[PDB]
Paper text:
The trimeric S protein mediates SARS-CoV-2 entry into host cells via the RBD, which binds to the angiotensin-converting enzyme 2 (ACE2) receptor. Three representative bnAbs, X01, X10, and X17, were further identified to offer potent cross-neutralizing activity against most VOCs but with a decreased neutralization breadth against Omicron. High-resolution cryo-electron microscopy (cryo-EM) structures revealed three nonoverlapping conserved epitopes and defined the structural basis for the neutralization breadth of the three bnAbs. Based on the previous categorization strategy, the nAbs X10, X01, and X17 are most likely classified as class 3, class 4, and class 5, respectively.
To define the conserved epitopes of the three cross-neutralizing antibodies, we first employed a cryo-EM approach to ascertain the complex structures of three-nAb combination in binding to the WT S proteins of SARS-CoV-2 (SARS-CoV-2-S) and SARS-CoV (SARS-CoV-S). Of interest, the simultaneous binding of all three nAbs to SARS-CoV-2-S caused a dissociation of the trimeric S protein, which allowed us to solve the structure of the monomeric S protein in complex with the three nAbs (SARS-CoV-2-S:X01:X10:X17). Superimposition of the atomic model of SARS-CoV-2-S:X01:X10:X17 onto the structure of the trimeric S protein showed conspicuous antibody-induced steric clashes mediated by both X10 and X17 but not X01, suggesting that X10 and X17 may harbor a dissociation potency toward the S trimer. Furthermore, we saw that X01 and X10, but not X17, occupied the space required for ACE2 binding, thereby blocking ACE2 action. The footprints of X01, X10, and X17 contained 18, 21, and 16 RBD residues respectively, with only the X10 footprint found to partially overlap with the ACE2-binding site (Y449, Q493). The footprints of three nAbs were nonoverlapping and therefore allowed for the simultaneous binding of all three nAbs to the RBD. The X10 epitope in its interaction with the WT RBD comprises 11 residues (R346, Y351, T345, N440, L441, D442, K444, Y449, N450, T470, and Q493) that form an extensive interaction network of 15 hydrogen bonds and one salt bridge. Similar to X10, there is an elaborate interaction network of 15 hydrogen bonds and four salt bridges between X01 and SARS-CoV-2 RBD at the interface. We found that X17 makes contact with the WT RBD primarily through nine residues (R355, R357, N394, Y396, D428, K462, F464, E516, H519) via 15 hydrogen bonds and five salt bridges; this binding pattern is highly similar in X17 binding to Delta RBD and SARS-CoV RBD. X01 recognizes a conserved epitope near the well-known CR3022 binding site but closer to the ACE2 binding site.
Numbering used by the authors:
A (entry chain L): 1 to 111
B (entry chain B), F (entry chain D): 1 to 107
C (entry chain H): 1 to 121
D (entry chain A), G (entry chain C): 1 to 119
E (entry chain G): 333 to 475, 483 to 526
C-alpha cells in the first residue's frame, strides 16, 4: 500500500509567476521508460480530469500549460501561466501495484 | 520423533587441522539434515541445508556428506574463526529434533 | 462521446443494500474496464476496485473486499456497484471511473457526475 | 539483509505470563513459517512450535502445547509467543527462526530473548 | 468435506507481476483436481515428483499456489533446474520440487493495442534467488538515472500482434508438501 | 497399461471425399488424446494435440473430435498428400501407448 | 532450428550391445525431456524410456526396464540409449522425440529425429 504525500498542502501563487507542486512516494514508482505517476485536477463539484499521464506525457485537450517531470521517488507538477480556472485540488496517483491510491492533494489560490 | 544423537558434545583441535563432526539419527531421514553454527554470543546461522554439501552463503570450507542415517559435517582448514556449537537437525518428521551441539575448543 | 451518469443521490441506513448503477454509452462497452473511486467530505480519493467486462470478474482493493460487490449485465450497457454492511464512516461521493482495456489500466480517462451517499437514520 | 529483530532480556515471577516478540522485517513475513525454539542452558535446541502468519494456523509440539501460545501481527510484521504457567524450568535463551523453503533449513534467525524465572 | 479454492487462484481477474508473485496456502479441505483435469485450456500441466494420474489419490499437509504472469517464451524456466531471468532474478523453484506447474495462455486479457505496461519483471540483480524467495526492492541497481545506474525493473509489452513467444501465459505453481505429520489436504 | 484400439488398420476411400478414423480407449483418458501422421519413409508429426487443437501449420482439413472413450479424426477433403498412417495416442497415464495404425489407400 | 539428428543405421549380432546417439542442437537442451520410442516395421509404436537432461532421472517401460539404459551428456546436448542383451525381436527403428516448444503436456511429441534402424 504505497502512500503519497504532497506539500505544500495549500499553495499561494500570483496570477503570472511560476508555480510548483510536488508529490513524493514511499517507493520508487518508476521504470527506465515510464514513470508511473498520473496527476489530476478537481474543482469543487467537478470530477477530476487527467492533466498529465505517466508524469511527462500530457493529455490532448487541456490548456497545455501544465508540464511536469520527475524520475524515481519524487515527482513535480508545474503551472507556468496561472489564471482563474486553476483554482483546484492537484492530486497524484500511481499505477504501480493493484492497490491504487491518490495523494493528499494541494489547493491553489490566486493572488 | 526421530532422535538425533550427536554422540560427541565437545571436540579438541588446533589451527589448520581437518576436523569432522558427526550426527546419528534413529530412523532414515532420507537426506533432510541441516548443520547450523551457534557462536557463543547466540548468533546462530545455517551452514549446509541439504546433507550432501549444499551450503548456504557460508565460506567454502564447510562441506559435509553422508547418506542413510549417519551424516557428518566437515571443516577442512580450521581457525579460531569457526569456534561454536554445531547443531544437526532432521527435516523429515514433526516435531523437528535438533542435535546436542559439538562445542569446538583449542587444544 | 464518452459520458457516464450514475444514479441519484441516495441516503442509507447503517447496514443496508444500495445499488449505485452506472449506465455507460459512447463507446464499445466490452473494451474498457469501469472502475470506481470514492471521496468523502473533502477526503483524498480511494480506489474501490473495478470490474472487467470481457472476463466477467473483478479486482477489488484490499480494504474494500468485504462491503463492495460489482455486477454487470453487458447487454444493458451498465456496470453496477453494491454497498452492504457499511459503516457510518463511508458516506461519500462514488465516481464511476473509466480505465483502459482489461488489466492494462493506468490512468482514469473519464469519470462520472458523482453519487453523494449519506448514511443516517 | 533480513533480520529477525527480537526483544531484549526479560525476567518473570513464577506464576505470571510473558509475551516475547520477534519482529521480522526485510522479507515477506506473511508468506513463510515462523518457528519458535527454546535452548535451555547446556543442551540442544528444542522446537516449541511454528505459526504461519498468513492465516494463523500453528504446528505445536507435544511438550509445550499447554503453556505456550503463538500469535502473529500481519500489519506490523511481528510474531508473538506467550509463555504462561511459568516455573523455574522456563529459563532459556528463546529464539525465532524461519525461511522461505523449510526443506532447506532455517535461513534467518533471531538473536535470542533470555527469560529468567526467579524471586 | 470442504472443497478448497482453486477458484480464487486460477480464474482470477488479475494476476500478480513476476517480481512480486502471489501465494495462497490452502489446507483443511478435500482437494478436487477434477476441475483442473478436464479442460483443454491449460497449455502446460507438468507434475513433478508426482504423476498427474494420482493427484486425486493422495493426502498432503499444505499446498502453495503461486500465481504470476510471465512471457510465453519463458514458461519453461518455471521448472526445477533451469536458468534465465524468471529463474534467476524473479522466481526460482527448488530442485526436489513436488507440485504441478500449470501455465495456460491469456492473451485476450493481459494485452492492449498500444501496450500493457502493468506486468513487470526484475531484469537486474546481484545474485540469483533462493528457492521460493521474492524481493520487492525497486531501488536503482548499479553495475540518479543515467549511465551505469539504471532502474532494475522493466515492464512487459503485450500487444495482441506479438506472435506466441511474446504473449501472456498466466502461470500457476501448485506446491505440495510431503512431510511426515498429520495429513491436512486429501483427495 | 492402458491400450488403445483403432477401427480399421487398413482404410480405403475415394480421393476428395471424407475419412472418419476412430480410436477406442481401454480406460478413461480425460481429454489427452493426440493424433499423428507418418507417411512411409519419415518420422511421425503431431497433428492434433489435445482432442481438437490443431498444431500450427497443419492444414485445416484435419479436424478431430470425440468424448468419453471413443474419439474420431476426420478429414474434410482428401488430397494425394494425406494418404499416410494415422496413429492414435494418449498421454493420461505414463504408458502413453500409441494406437495400432491406419494406412489410407486411395480406392 | 530444432534439429534432432541421430546416428546412421546399425547392424548387430544377437546377444550383443550397441549405443544409439541423439544429438540435439538449436534450443535450451537442459529444459526439455528427451523421450524415446520404437517402431517395428509396419506396426504400432510403443515406449522405451524418457530422460531429463539436468538431473538424469529416467522413467522406463516395464518391457524395457532390463534391456535399455538411458543416460545423458550435458556437454554436447546428446542423449544416448544403451541396449544390452539384444535379440532378433528387438530390431526396429528408434526415435528421440522432444515435446513441443509451447505445449507443455508431458506426453505429446512434436519434434522427432530421423530414425535409426537397428538389426
Ligand atoms: C473458473 O471459473 C469458470 C467459470 O465458469 C469455471 O468454468 C472454471 O472451471 C473455473 N476454474 C477453475 C480452475 O475452477
Amino acid at each position: 500500500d504505497i502512500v503519497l504525500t504532497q506539500s505544500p498542502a495549500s499553495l499561494a501563487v500570483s496570477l503570472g509567476q511560476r508555480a510548483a507542486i510536488s508529490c513524493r512516494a514511499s517507493q520508487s514508482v518508476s521504470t527506465s521508460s515510464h514513470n508511473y505517476v498520473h496527476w489530476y485536477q478537481q474543482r469543487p463539484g467537478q470530477p477530476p480530469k487527467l492533466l498529465i499521464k505517466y508524469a511527462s506525457n500530457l493529455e490532448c485537450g487541456v490548456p497545455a500549460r501544465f508540464s511536469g517531470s520527475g524520475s524515481g521517488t519524487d515527482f513535480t507538477l508545474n503551472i507556468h501561466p496561472v489564471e482563474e480556472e486553476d483554482s483546484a485540488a492537484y492530486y497524484c496517483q500511481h499505477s504501480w501495484e493493484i492497490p491504487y491510491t491518490f495523494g493528499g492533494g494541494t489547493k491553489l489560490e490566486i493572488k | 520423533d526421530i532422535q538425533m544423537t550427536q554422540t560427541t558434545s565437545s571436540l579438541s583441535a588446533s589451527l589448520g587441522d581437518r576436523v569432522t563432526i558427526s550426527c546419528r539419527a534413529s530412523q532414515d531421514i532420507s537426506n533432510y539434515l541441516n548443520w547450523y553454527q551457534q557462536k557463543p554470543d547466540g548468533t546462530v546461522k545455517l551452514l549446509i541445508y541439504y546433507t550432501s554439501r549444499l551450503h548456504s552463503g557460508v565460506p567454502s570450507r564447510f562441506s559435509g556428506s553422508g547418506s542413510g542415517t549417519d551424516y557428518s559435517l566437515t571443516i577442512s582448514n580450521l581457525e579460531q574463526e569457526d569456534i561454536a556449537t554445531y547443531f544437526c537437525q532432521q527435516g523429515t518428521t514433526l516435531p523437528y529434533t535438533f542435535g546436542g551441539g559439538t562445542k569446538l575448543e583449542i587444544k | 462521446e464518452v459520458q457516464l451518469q450514475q444514479s441519484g443521490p441516495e441516503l442509507v441506513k447503517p447496514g443496508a443494500s444500495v445499488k449505485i448503477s452506472c449506465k455507460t454509452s459512447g463507446y464499445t462497452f466490452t473494451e474498457y474496464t469501469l472502475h470506481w473511486v470514492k471521496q468523502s467530505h473533502g477526503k483524498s480519493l480511494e480506489w474501490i476496485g473495478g470490474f472487467d467486462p470481457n472476463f466477467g470478474g473483478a479486482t477489488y482493493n484490499l480494504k474494500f473486499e468485504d462491503k463492495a460487490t460489482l455486477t454487470v449485465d453487458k447487454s444493458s450497457n451498465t456496470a453496477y456497484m453494491e454497498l452492504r454492511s457499511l459503516t457510518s464512516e463511508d458516506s461519500a461521493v462514488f465516481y464511476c471511473a473509466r480505465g483502459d482495456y482489461g488489466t492494462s489500466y493506468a490512468y482514469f480517462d473519464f469519470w462520472g457526475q458523482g453519487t453523494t451517499l449519506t448514511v443516517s437514520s | 539483509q533480513v533480520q529477525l529483530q527480537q526483544s531484549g532480556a526479560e525476567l518473570a515471577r513464577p506464576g505470571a505470563s510473558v509475551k516475547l516478540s520477534c519482529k521480522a522485517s526485510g522479507y515477506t513475513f506473511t508468506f513463510y513459517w515462523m518457528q519458535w525454539l527454546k535452548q535451555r542452558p547446556g543442551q540442544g535446541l528444542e522446537w516449541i512450535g511454528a505459526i504461519y502468519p498468513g492465516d494463523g494456523d500453528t504446528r505445536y509440539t507435544q511438550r509445550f502445547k499447554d503453556k505456550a501460545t503463538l500469535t502473529a501481527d500481519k500489519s506490523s510484521s511481528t510474531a508473538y509467543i506467550q509463555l504462561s504457567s511459568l516455573a523455574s524450568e522456563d529459563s532459556a535463551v528463546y529464539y525465532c527462526a524461519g525461511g522461505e523453503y523449510d526443506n532447506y533449513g532455517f535461513d534467518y534467525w533471531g538473536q535470542g530473548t533470555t527469560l529468567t524465572v526467579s524471586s | 468435506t470442504n472443497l478448497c479454492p482453486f477458484g480464487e487462484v486460477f480464474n482470477a481477474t488479475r494476476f500478480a507481476s513476476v517480481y512480486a508473485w502471489n501465494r495462497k496456502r490452502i489446507s483443511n479441505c478435500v482437494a478436487d483436481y477434477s476441475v483442473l483435469y478436464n479442460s483443454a485450456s491449460f497449455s502446460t500441466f507438468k507434475c513433478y515428483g508426482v504423476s498427474p494420474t494420482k493427484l486425486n489419490d493422495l493426502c498432503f499437509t499444505n499446498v502453495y499456489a503461486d500465481s504470476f504472469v510471465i512471457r510465453g517464451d519463458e514458461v519453461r524456466q518455471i521448472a526445477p533446474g533451469q536458468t534465465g531471468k524468471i529463474a534467476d532474478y524473479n522466481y526460482k523453484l527448488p530442485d526436489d520440487f513436488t507440485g504441478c506447474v500449470i501455465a495456460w495462455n491469456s492473451n485476450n486479457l493481459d494485452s492492449k493495442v498500444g501496450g500493457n505496461y502493468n506486468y513487470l519483471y526484475r531484469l537486474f540483480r546481484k545474485s540469483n534467488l533462493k528457492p521460493f524467495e521474492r524481493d520487492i526492492s525497486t531501488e536503482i541497481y548499479q553495475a540518479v538515472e543515467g549511465f551505469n545506474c539504471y532502474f532494475p525493473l522493466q515492464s512487459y509489452g503485450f500487444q495482441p500482434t506479438n506472435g506466441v513467444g511474446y504473449q501472456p501465459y498466466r502461470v500457476v505453481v501448485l506446491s505440495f508438501e510431503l512431510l511426515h505429520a498429520p495429513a491436512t489436504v486429501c483427495g | 497399461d492402458i491400450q488403445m484400439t483403432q477401427s480399421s488398420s487398413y482404410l480405403s476411400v475415394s480421393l476428395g471425399g471424407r475419412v472418419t478414423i476412430t480410436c477406442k480407449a481401454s480406460d478413461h483418458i480425460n481429454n489427452w488424446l493426440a493424433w499423428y501422421q507418418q507417411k512411409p519413409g519419415n518420422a511421425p508429426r503431431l497433428l492434433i494435440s489435445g482432442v481438437t487443437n490443431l498444431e500450427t501449420g497443419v492444414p485445416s482439413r484435419f479436424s478431430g473430435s470425440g468424448s468419453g472413450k471413443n474419439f474420431t479424426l476426420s478429414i474434410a477433403s482428401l488430397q494425394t498428400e494425406d494418404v499416410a498412417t494415422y496413429y492414435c495416442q494418449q498421454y493420461w497415464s505414463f504408458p502413453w501407448t500409441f494406437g495400432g495404425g491406419t494406412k489410407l489407400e486411395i480406392r | 532450428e530444432i534439429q534432432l539428428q541421430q546416428s546412421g543405421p546399425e547392424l548387430v549380432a544377437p546377444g550383443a550391445s550397441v549405443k544409439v546417439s541423439c544429438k540435439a542442437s538449436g534450443y535450451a537442451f537442459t529444459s526439455y525431456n528427451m523421450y524415446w520410442v520404437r517402431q517395428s516395421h509396419g506396426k504400432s509404436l510403443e515406449w522405451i524410456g524418457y530422460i531429463v537432461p539436468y538431473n538424469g532421472g529416467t522413467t522406463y517401460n516395464q518391457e524395457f526396464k532390463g534391456k535399455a539404459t538411458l543416460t545423458v551428456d550435458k556437454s554436447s546436448n546428446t542423449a544416448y540409449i544403451h541396449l544390452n542383451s539384444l535379440t532378433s525381436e528387438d530390431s526396429a527403428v528408434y526415435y528421440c522425440a522432444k515435446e513441443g516448444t509451447y505445449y507443455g503436456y508431458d506426453g505429446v511429441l512434436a519434434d522427432w529425429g530421423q530414425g535409426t534402424l537397428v538389426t
